[PDB]
Design a protein around this ligand. Structure first.
Ligand SMILES: O=C(O)CCc1nc(-c2ccccc2)c(-c2cc(Cl)cc(Cl)c2)o1
Ligand SMILES: O=C(O)CCc1nc(-c2ccccc2)c(-c2cc(Cl)cc(Cl)c2)o1
Lengths: 13, 212, 212, 13
Protein backbone atom coordinates (compact mmCIF):
# COMPACT_ATOMS: atom_id res chain seq x y z
CA UNK A 1 0.00 0.00 0.00
CA UNK A 2 2.40 2.74 -1.33
CA UNK A 3 -0.36 5.36 -0.62
CA UNK A 4 1.61 8.60 -1.32
CA UNK A 5 3.54 7.34 -4.42
CA UNK A 6 0.33 5.95 -6.09
CA UNK A 7 -1.52 9.31 -5.55
CA UNK A 8 1.34 11.48 -7.02
CA UNK A 9 1.55 9.08 -10.04
CA UNK A 10 -2.21 9.24 -11.01
CA UNK A 11 -2.47 13.07 -10.75
CA UNK A 12 -2.49 14.48 -14.35
CA UNK A 13 -0.01 17.46 -14.05
CA UNK B 1 13.86 9.82 -32.23
CA UNK B 2 11.76 7.55 -29.92
CA UNK B 3 13.86 8.92 -26.93
CA UNK B 4 15.27 12.42 -27.71
CA UNK B 5 17.85 13.88 -25.21
CA UNK B 6 16.13 17.30 -25.61
CA UNK B 7 13.07 16.06 -23.58
CA UNK B 8 15.27 14.28 -20.93
CA UNK B 9 17.20 17.61 -20.49
CA UNK B 10 13.84 19.52 -20.16
CA UNK B 11 12.78 16.98 -17.45
CA UNK B 12 15.95 17.93 -15.48
CA UNK B 13 15.48 21.72 -16.07
CA UNK B 14 11.74 21.59 -15.12
CA UNK B 15 12.42 20.25 -11.53
CA UNK B 16 15.40 22.58 -10.70
CA UNK B 17 15.47 24.14 -7.17
CA UNK B 18 21.49 21.24 13.68
CA UNK B 19 21.78 17.45 12.81
CA UNK B 20 23.03 17.08 9.19
CA UNK B 21 21.30 13.63 9.00
CA UNK B 22 17.99 15.43 9.84
CA UNK B 23 18.74 18.03 7.11
CA UNK B 24 19.65 15.29 4.56
CA UNK B 25 16.36 13.46 5.46
CA UNK B 26 14.15 16.62 5.15
CA UNK B 27 15.77 17.26 1.70
CA UNK B 28 15.31 13.58 0.63
CA UNK B 29 11.59 13.69 1.55
CA UNK B 30 11.14 17.05 -0.26
CA UNK B 31 12.88 15.68 -3.40
CA UNK B 32 10.78 12.45 -3.42
CA UNK B 33 7.80 14.63 -4.59
CA UNK B 34 10.03 16.29 -7.26
CA UNK B 35 11.29 12.81 -8.32
CA UNK B 36 7.73 11.67 -9.27
CA UNK B 37 7.25 14.94 -11.31
CA UNK B 38 10.68 14.35 -13.01
CA UNK B 39 9.79 10.71 -13.90
CA UNK B 40 6.51 11.73 -15.61
CA UNK B 41 8.46 14.14 -17.93
CA UNK B 42 10.80 11.29 -19.06
CA UNK B 43 9.42 10.13 -22.44
CA UNK B 44 7.26 6.92 -22.25
CA UNK B 45 7.43 6.55 -18.40
CA UNK B 46 3.80 7.74 -17.88
CA UNK B 47 2.65 5.22 -20.60
CA UNK B 48 3.85 2.23 -18.48
CA UNK B 49 1.20 0.49 -16.33
CA UNK B 50 0.89 2.32 -12.92
CA UNK B 51 2.16 -0.90 -11.17
CA UNK B 52 5.45 -0.80 -13.18
CA UNK B 53 5.84 2.97 -12.68
CA UNK B 54 5.62 2.17 -8.91
CA UNK B 55 8.16 -0.74 -9.18
CA UNK B 56 10.73 1.36 -11.17
CA UNK B 57 10.65 4.31 -8.72
CA UNK B 58 10.65 1.98 -5.66
CA UNK B 59 13.70 0.30 -7.28
CA UNK B 60 15.35 3.57 -8.49
CA UNK B 61 14.53 6.43 -6.06
CA UNK B 62 17.66 6.20 -3.86
CA UNK B 63 20.05 6.21 -6.88
CA UNK B 64 17.98 8.93 -8.65
CA UNK B 65 18.18 11.26 -5.59
CA UNK B 66 21.94 10.52 -5.16
CA UNK B 67 22.65 11.28 -8.89
CA UNK B 68 20.84 14.68 -8.55
CA UNK B 69 22.54 16.03 -5.37
CA UNK B 70 25.95 14.73 -6.58
CA UNK B 71 25.70 16.64 -9.96
CA UNK B 72 24.24 19.69 -8.10
CA UNK B 73 27.42 19.61 -5.89
CA UNK B 74 30.18 19.74 -8.64
CA UNK B 75 30.95 23.48 -7.99
CA UNK B 76 31.11 22.77 -4.20
CA UNK B 77 34.39 21.91 -2.34
CA UNK B 78 34.51 18.90 0.08
CA UNK B 79 30.68 19.09 0.54
CA UNK B 80 27.19 18.61 -1.03
CA UNK B 81 24.43 21.14 -1.86
CA UNK B 82 20.96 19.97 -0.63
CA UNK B 83 17.70 20.89 -2.48
CA UNK B 84 16.76 22.86 0.72
CA UNK B 85 19.60 25.33 -0.29
CA UNK B 86 21.79 24.06 2.61
CA UNK B 87 25.42 22.99 1.84
CA UNK B 88 26.73 20.07 3.99
CA UNK B 89 30.56 19.85 4.43
CA UNK B 90 32.43 16.52 5.00
CA UNK B 91 33.51 17.80 8.47
CA UNK B 92 29.75 17.98 9.44
CA UNK B 93 29.05 14.54 7.86
CA UNK B 94 32.01 12.98 9.83
CA UNK B 95 30.77 14.62 13.09
CA UNK B 96 27.26 13.05 12.68
CA UNK B 97 28.94 9.62 12.08
CA UNK B 98 28.28 9.38 8.26
CA UNK B 99 31.80 10.42 7.08
CA UNK B 100 32.63 7.15 5.25
CA UNK B 101 29.52 7.12 2.97
CA UNK B 102 29.84 10.94 2.60
CA UNK B 103 33.51 10.54 1.45
CA UNK B 104 32.30 7.87 -1.05
CA UNK B 105 29.79 10.37 -2.56
CA UNK B 106 32.57 13.02 -2.91
CA UNK B 107 35.29 10.67 -4.30
CA UNK B 108 33.23 8.30 -6.56
CA UNK B 109 30.46 10.66 -7.78
CA UNK B 110 30.90 14.46 -7.20
CA UNK B 111 34.64 14.56 -8.02
CA UNK B 112 34.19 12.28 -11.10
CA UNK B 113 31.32 14.53 -12.39
CA UNK B 114 33.50 17.70 -11.87
CA UNK B 115 36.63 16.13 -13.49
CA UNK B 116 34.72 15.13 -16.69
CA UNK B 117 32.29 18.19 -16.47
CA UNK B 118 29.26 15.82 -16.77
CA UNK B 119 26.59 18.12 -18.31
CA UNK B 120 22.86 18.05 -17.42
CA UNK B 121 21.78 16.11 -20.58
CA UNK B 122 24.26 13.41 -19.42
CA UNK B 123 22.93 13.42 -15.79
CA UNK B 124 19.42 13.24 -17.36
CA UNK B 125 20.27 10.18 -19.52
CA UNK B 126 22.12 8.33 -16.66
CA UNK B 127 19.06 8.93 -14.39
CA UNK B 128 16.73 7.77 -17.26
CA UNK B 129 18.86 4.59 -17.61
CA UNK B 130 18.63 4.02 -13.79
CA UNK B 131 14.82 4.65 -13.93
CA UNK B 132 14.35 2.13 -16.79
CA UNK B 133 15.86 -0.74 -14.78
CA UNK B 134 14.67 -4.00 -16.42
CA UNK B 135 16.03 -6.03 -13.42
CA UNK B 136 13.32 -4.48 -11.09
CA UNK B 137 11.28 -7.34 -9.54
CA UNK B 138 7.61 -7.80 -10.58
CA UNK B 139 7.58 -5.73 -13.85
CA UNK B 140 4.67 -6.85 -16.11
CA UNK B 141 6.93 -6.39 -19.24
CA UNK B 142 10.71 -6.33 -18.51
CA UNK B 143 11.41 -6.32 -22.35
CA UNK B 144 9.55 -2.94 -22.64
CA UNK B 145 11.76 -1.35 -19.88
CA UNK B 146 14.90 -2.99 -21.39
CA UNK B 147 13.96 -1.46 -24.82
CA UNK B 148 13.42 1.99 -23.17
CA UNK B 149 16.84 1.58 -21.42
CA UNK B 150 18.34 0.66 -24.89
CA UNK B 151 16.83 3.83 -26.52
CA UNK B 152 18.22 6.12 -23.71
CA UNK B 153 21.86 4.90 -23.93
CA UNK B 154 21.75 4.90 -27.78
CA UNK B 155 20.69 8.65 -27.60
CA UNK B 156 23.41 9.24 -24.93
CA UNK B 157 26.16 7.58 -27.10
CA UNK B 158 25.08 9.80 -30.07
CA UNK B 159 24.88 13.01 -27.87
CA UNK B 160 28.44 12.28 -26.55
CA UNK B 161 29.93 11.41 -30.04
CA UNK B 162 28.34 14.69 -31.38
CA UNK B 163 28.81 17.11 -28.39
CA UNK B 164 32.28 15.86 -27.19
CA UNK B 165 33.73 14.20 -30.36
CA UNK B 166 37.30 14.79 -28.89
CA UNK B 167 36.49 12.32 -25.99
CA UNK B 168 35.85 8.88 -27.60
CA UNK B 169 35.68 7.15 -24.15
CA UNK B 170 33.21 9.68 -22.55
CA UNK B 171 30.16 7.36 -23.09
CA UNK B 172 31.85 4.34 -21.36
CA UNK B 173 33.06 6.75 -18.58
CA UNK B 174 29.43 7.94 -17.93
CA UNK B 175 28.10 4.32 -17.81
CA UNK B 176 31.00 3.39 -15.46
CA UNK B 177 29.72 5.75 -12.69
CA UNK B 178 26.53 3.55 -12.37
CA UNK B 179 28.23 0.74 -10.35
CA UNK B 180 29.49 3.28 -7.79
CA UNK B 181 25.93 4.73 -7.82
CA UNK B 182 24.39 1.31 -7.15
CA UNK B 183 26.93 0.75 -4.33
CA UNK B 184 26.45 4.17 -2.64
CA UNK B 185 22.62 3.86 -3.00
CA UNK B 186 22.60 0.54 -1.10
CA UNK B 187 24.88 1.88 1.71
CA UNK B 188 22.73 5.06 1.98
CA UNK B 189 19.60 2.87 2.18
CA UNK B 190 21.19 0.72 4.97
CA UNK B 191 21.86 4.06 6.91
CA UNK B 192 18.27 5.38 6.51
CA UNK B 193 16.89 1.95 7.70
CA UNK B 194 19.10 2.43 10.78
CA UNK B 195 17.97 6.08 11.41
CA UNK B 196 14.34 4.76 11.10
CA UNK B 197 14.83 1.61 13.29
CA UNK B 198 16.47 3.78 16.03
CA UNK B 199 14.14 6.88 16.12
CA UNK B 200 17.27 9.15 16.37
CA UNK B 201 16.04 11.17 13.30
CA UNK B 202 12.67 12.62 12.14
CA UNK B 203 11.70 10.67 8.93
CA UNK B 204 8.88 12.58 7.08
CA UNK B 205 5.92 10.55 5.66
CA UNK B 206 7.01 9.93 1.99
CA UNK B 207 10.64 9.03 2.90
CA UNK B 208 9.07 6.74 5.57
CA UNK B 209 6.81 5.07 2.91
CA UNK B 210 9.86 4.38 0.63
CA UNK B 211 11.53 2.60 3.67
CA UNK B 212 8.54 0.15 4.19
CA UNK C 1 47.97 -2.14 -28.21
CA UNK C 2 48.86 -1.32 -24.54
CA UNK C 3 45.93 -3.68 -23.48
CA UNK C 4 45.23 -6.33 -26.19
CA UNK C 5 42.05 -8.50 -25.74
CA UNK C 6 44.10 -11.54 -26.94
CA UNK C 7 46.07 -11.60 -23.61
CA UNK C 8 42.90 -10.99 -21.47
CA UNK C 9 41.24 -13.98 -23.29
CA UNK C 10 44.41 -16.14 -22.63
CA UNK C 11 44.15 -15.16 -18.90
CA UNK C 12 40.58 -16.60 -18.88
CA UNK C 13 41.57 -19.76 -20.86
CA UNK C 14 44.67 -20.40 -18.65
CA UNK C 15 42.60 -20.72 -15.38
CA UNK C 16 39.75 -22.91 -16.83
CA UNK C 17 38.52 -25.85 -14.66
CA UNK C 18 24.99 -31.94 1.44
CA UNK C 19 24.70 -28.15 2.31
CA UNK C 20 24.85 -26.11 -0.96
CA UNK C 21 26.21 -23.11 1.06
CA UNK C 22 29.13 -25.38 2.17
CA UNK C 23 29.67 -26.42 -1.49
CA UNK C 24 29.52 -22.77 -2.70
CA UNK C 25 32.07 -21.83 0.06
CA UNK C 26 34.51 -24.71 -0.78
CA UNK C 27 34.35 -23.61 -4.48
CA UNK C 28 34.84 -19.90 -3.55
CA UNK C 29 37.95 -20.74 -1.47
CA UNK C 30 39.33 -22.97 -4.27
CA UNK C 31 38.76 -20.20 -6.88
CA UNK C 32 40.42 -17.50 -4.68
CA UNK C 33 43.80 -19.19 -5.51
CA UNK C 34 42.88 -19.30 -9.25
CA UNK C 35 41.79 -15.61 -9.05
CA UNK C 36 45.33 -14.49 -8.00
CA UNK C 37 46.82 -16.55 -10.94
CA UNK C 38 44.22 -14.96 -13.33
CA UNK C 39 45.05 -11.40 -12.12
CA UNK C 40 48.80 -11.85 -12.75
CA UNK C 41 48.08 -12.80 -16.44
CA UNK C 42 46.07 -9.54 -16.97
CA UNK C 43 48.49 -7.14 -18.71
CA UNK C 44 50.13 -4.56 -16.33
CA UNK C 45 48.51 -5.91 -13.08
CA UNK C 46 51.80 -7.53 -11.85
CA UNK C 47 53.63 -4.18 -12.53
CA UNK C 48 51.47 -2.35 -9.92
CA UNK C 49 52.97 -1.98 -6.41
CA UNK C 50 52.17 -5.15 -4.32
CA UNK C 51 50.05 -2.94 -1.93
CA UNK C 52 47.76 -1.84 -4.83
CA UNK C 53 47.55 -5.40 -6.24
CA UNK C 54 46.29 -6.37 -2.73
CA UNK C 55 43.78 -3.42 -2.60
CA UNK C 56 42.33 -4.18 -6.10
CA UNK C 57 41.77 -7.91 -5.37
CA UNK C 58 40.43 -7.19 -1.84
CA UNK C 59 38.05 -4.70 -3.55
CA UNK C 60 37.27 -6.92 -6.59
CA UNK C 61 37.38 -10.62 -5.57
CA UNK C 62 33.66 -11.12 -4.82
CA UNK C 63 32.56 -9.57 -8.18
CA UNK C 64 35.38 -11.40 -10.07
CA UNK C 65 34.26 -14.82 -8.67
CA UNK C 66 30.57 -14.01 -9.38
CA UNK C 67 31.35 -12.97 -13.02
CA UNK C 68 33.21 -16.32 -13.59
CA UNK C 69 30.58 -18.78 -12.21
CA UNK C 70 27.76 -16.77 -13.89
CA UNK C 71 29.41 -17.01 -17.40
CA UNK C 72 30.35 -20.68 -16.69
CA UNK C 73 26.59 -21.31 -16.02
CA UNK C 74 25.06 -19.96 -19.35
CA UNK C 75 24.44 -23.51 -20.76
CA UNK C 76 22.82 -24.54 -17.40
CA UNK C 77 19.03 -24.30 -16.70
CA UNK C 78 17.76 -22.68 -13.44
CA UNK C 79 21.15 -23.39 -11.73
CA UNK C 80 24.91 -22.58 -11.51
CA UNK C 81 27.99 -24.72 -12.29
CA UNK C 82 30.65 -24.54 -9.50
CA UNK C 83 34.43 -24.83 -10.21
CA UNK C 84 34.30 -28.09 -8.12
CA UNK C 85 32.27 -29.58 -11.08
CA UNK C 86 29.05 -29.54 -8.96
CA UNK C 87 25.88 -27.92 -10.46
CA UNK C 88 23.62 -26.14 -7.89
CA UNK C 89 19.89 -25.80 -8.85
CA UNK C 90 17.65 -22.91 -7.60
CA UNK C 91 15.49 -25.50 -5.73
CA UNK C 92 18.63 -26.42 -3.63
CA UNK C 93 19.54 -22.72 -3.14
CA UNK C 94 15.93 -21.93 -1.93
CA UNK C 95 16.03 -24.95 0.46
CA UNK C 96 19.29 -23.68 2.12
CA UNK C 97 17.65 -20.20 2.53
CA UNK C 98 19.64 -18.36 -0.24
CA UNK C 99 16.92 -18.44 -2.97
CA UNK C 100 16.54 -14.64 -3.32
CA UNK C 101 20.25 -13.89 -4.03
CA UNK C 102 20.43 -17.11 -6.14
CA UNK C 103 17.43 -15.91 -8.26
CA UNK C 104 19.23 -12.53 -8.67
CA UNK C 105 22.33 -14.32 -10.09
CA UNK C 106 20.13 -16.28 -12.57
CA UNK C 107 17.92 -13.32 -13.67
CA UNK C 108 20.43 -10.40 -13.71
CA UNK C 109 23.66 -12.21 -14.72
CA UNK C 110 23.39 -15.82 -16.09
CA UNK C 111 20.24 -15.20 -18.19
CA UNK C 112 21.58 -11.85 -19.53
CA UNK C 113 24.92 -13.55 -20.53
CA UNK C 114 22.99 -16.41 -22.31
CA UNK C 115 20.56 -14.01 -24.09
CA UNK C 116 23.42 -11.88 -25.56
CA UNK C 117 25.86 -14.92 -25.83
CA UNK C 118 28.56 -12.94 -23.92
CA UNK C 119 31.80 -14.55 -25.20
CA UNK C 120 34.92 -15.23 -23.07
CA UNK C 121 36.91 -12.19 -24.39
CA UNK C 122 33.94 -10.07 -23.17
CA UNK C 123 33.84 -11.81 -19.72
CA UNK C 124 37.65 -11.26 -19.62
CA UNK C 125 37.39 -7.50 -20.35
CA UNK C 126 34.45 -6.96 -17.87
CA UNK C 127 36.50 -8.77 -15.16
CA UNK C 128 39.60 -6.67 -16.12
CA UNK C 129 37.47 -3.48 -15.79
CA UNK C 130 36.23 -4.69 -12.34
CA UNK C 131 39.86 -5.53 -11.32
CA UNK C 132 41.12 -2.06 -12.37
CA UNK C 133 38.73 -0.25 -10.02
CA UNK C 134 40.14 3.27 -9.47
CA UNK C 135 37.60 3.89 -6.63
CA UNK C 136 39.38 1.23 -4.41
CA UNK C 137 40.44 2.91 -1.12
CA UNK C 138 44.18 3.45 -0.42
CA UNK C 139 45.59 3.04 -3.99
CA UNK C 140 49.02 4.79 -4.27
CA UNK C 141 48.13 5.96 -7.86
CA UNK C 142 44.37 5.92 -8.69
CA UNK C 143 45.14 7.68 -12.09
CA UNK C 144 47.27 4.62 -13.14
CA UNK C 145 44.35 2.18 -12.40
CA UNK C 146 41.86 4.60 -14.07
CA UNK C 147 44.13 4.66 -17.20
CA UNK C 148 44.33 0.81 -17.18
CA UNK C 149 40.48 0.70 -16.83
CA UNK C 150 40.29 3.19 -19.81
CA UNK C 151 42.57 0.95 -21.99
CA UNK C 152 40.46 -2.21 -21.22
CA UNK C 153 37.06 -0.70 -22.20
CA UNK C 154 38.59 0.99 -25.31
CA UNK C 155 39.83 -2.52 -26.43
CA UNK C 156 36.39 -3.99 -25.51
CA UNK C 157 34.49 -1.30 -27.56
CA UNK C 158 36.79 -2.06 -30.58
CA UNK C 159 36.46 -5.92 -30.13
CA UNK C 160 32.61 -5.53 -30.04
CA UNK C 161 32.45 -3.08 -33.06
CA UNK C 162 34.70 -5.55 -35.01
CA UNK C 163 33.38 -8.99 -33.82
CA UNK C 164 29.61 -8.10 -33.57
CA UNK C 165 29.29 -5.09 -35.96
CA UNK C 166 25.50 -5.94 -36.33
CA UNK C 167 24.96 -5.09 -32.57
CA UNK C 168 25.84 -1.36 -32.13
CA UNK C 169 24.57 -1.37 -28.48
CA UNK C 170 26.48 -4.56 -27.38
CA UNK C 171 29.30 -2.52 -25.67
CA UNK C 172 26.83 -0.43 -23.54
CA UNK C 173 24.90 -3.71 -22.79
CA UNK C 174 28.12 -5.38 -21.44
CA UNK C 175 28.99 -2.33 -19.25
CA UNK C 176 25.35 -2.28 -17.99
CA UNK C 177 25.72 -5.72 -16.29
CA UNK C 178 28.36 -4.18 -13.88
CA UNK C 179 25.78 -2.42 -11.61
CA UNK C 180 23.90 -5.71 -11.12
CA UNK C 181 27.33 -7.31 -10.46
CA UNK C 182 28.21 -4.69 -7.84
CA UNK C 183 24.77 -5.21 -6.21
CA UNK C 184 24.90 -9.05 -6.18
CA UNK C 185 28.54 -8.96 -4.92
CA UNK C 186 27.55 -6.84 -1.89
CA UNK C 187 24.53 -9.07 -1.03
CA UNK C 188 26.71 -12.22 -1.42
CA UNK C 189 29.33 -10.64 0.87
CA UNK C 190 26.64 -9.81 3.51
CA UNK C 191 25.60 -13.59 3.38
CA UNK C 192 29.19 -14.91 3.79
CA UNK C 193 29.72 -12.50 6.79
CA UNK C 194 26.58 -14.10 8.27
CA UNK C 195 27.72 -17.74 7.60
CA UNK C 196 31.07 -16.75 9.26
CA UNK C 197 29.53 -14.85 12.27
CA UNK C 198 27.19 -17.86 12.94
CA UNK C 199 29.59 -20.87 12.50
CA UNK C 200 26.81 -22.73 10.55
CA UNK C 201 29.27 -23.29 7.60
CA UNK C 202 32.95 -24.36 7.26
CA UNK C 203 34.85 -21.29 5.85
CA UNK C 204 38.31 -22.44 4.53
CA UNK C 205 41.39 -20.26 5.36
CA UNK C 206 41.69 -17.99 2.24
CA UNK C 207 37.91 -17.26 2.04
CA UNK C 208 38.17 -16.53 5.82
CA UNK C 209 41.09 -14.07 5.21
CA UNK C 210 39.06 -12.18 2.53
CA UNK C 211 36.22 -11.78 5.19
CA UNK C 212 38.58 -10.09 7.80
CA UNK D 1 48.01 -8.87 7.59
CA UNK D 2 46.53 -10.51 4.42
CA UNK D 3 49.06 -13.42 4.85
CA UNK D 4 47.79 -15.82 2.11
CA UNK D 5 47.03 -13.15 -0.57
CA UNK D 6 50.49 -11.46 -0.14
CA UNK D 7 52.30 -14.86 -0.50
CA UNK D 8 50.39 -15.89 -3.71
CA UNK D 9 51.10 -12.40 -5.20
CA UNK D 10 54.95 -12.45 -4.68
CA UNK D 11 55.44 -16.01 -6.06
CA UNK D 12 56.91 -15.67 -9.62
CA UNK D 13 54.77 -18.24 -11.61
O1 LIG E 1 19.02 17.07 -1.47
C1 LIG E 1 18.74 16.05 -2.24
O2 LIG E 1 18.61 16.13 -3.44
C2 LIG E 1 18.60 14.77 -1.48
C3 LIG E 1 19.64 14.61 -0.38
C4 LIG E 1 19.86 13.20 0.02
N1 LIG E 1 19.14 12.17 -0.29
C5 LIG E 1 19.80 11.10 0.31
C6 LIG E 1 19.27 9.74 0.13
C7 LIG E 1 20.10 8.64 0.12
C8 LIG E 1 19.58 7.38 -0.13
C9 LIG E 1 18.25 7.21 -0.39
C10 LIG E 1 17.43 8.30 -0.42
C11 LIG E 1 17.92 9.56 -0.14
C12 LIG E 1 20.91 11.56 0.96
C13 LIG E 1 22.03 10.99 1.71
C14 LIG E 1 23.30 11.54 1.59
C15 LIG E 1 24.33 11.01 2.34
CL1 LIG E 1 25.93 11.64 2.13
C16 LIG E 1 24.14 9.97 3.23
C17 LIG E 1 22.87 9.43 3.31
CL2 LIG E 1 22.58 8.13 4.41
C18 LIG E 1 21.81 9.92 2.57
O3 LIG E 1 20.95 12.92 0.79
O1 LIG F 1 32.50 -21.75 -8.19
C1 LIG F 1 32.95 -20.52 -8.25
O2 LIG F 1 33.51 -20.07 -9.23
C2 LIG F 1 32.67 -19.72 -7.01
C3 LIG F 1 31.30 -19.98 -6.43
C4 LIG F 1 30.82 -18.88 -5.56
N1 LIG F 1 31.50 -17.89 -5.09
C5 LIG F 1 30.57 -17.14 -4.37
C6 LIG F 1 31.02 -15.90 -3.72
C7 LIG F 1 30.15 -14.83 -3.54
C8 LIG F 1 30.61 -13.64 -3.01
C9 LIG F 1 31.92 -13.50 -2.65
C10 LIG F 1 32.79 -14.54 -2.85
C11 LIG F 1 32.34 -15.74 -3.37
C12 LIG F 1 29.35 -17.74 -4.45
C13 LIG F 1 27.99 -17.46 -4.00
C14 LIG F 1 26.91 -17.78 -4.81
C15 LIG F 1 25.63 -17.55 -4.34
CL1 LIG F 1 24.29 -17.88 -5.39
C16 LIG F 1 25.39 -17.03 -3.09
C17 LIG F 1 26.48 -16.71 -2.31
CL2 LIG F 1 26.23 -16.05 -0.73
C18 LIG F 1 27.77 -16.91 -2.75
O3 LIG F 1 29.50 -18.87 -5.21
Amino acid sequence: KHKILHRLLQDSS
Amino acid sequence: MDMPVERILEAELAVEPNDPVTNICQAADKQLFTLVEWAKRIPHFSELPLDDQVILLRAGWNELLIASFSHRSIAVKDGILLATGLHVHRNSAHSAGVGAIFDRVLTELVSKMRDMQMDKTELGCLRAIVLFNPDSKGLSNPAEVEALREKVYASLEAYCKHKYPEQPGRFAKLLLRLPALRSIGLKCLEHLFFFKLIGDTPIDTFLMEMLE
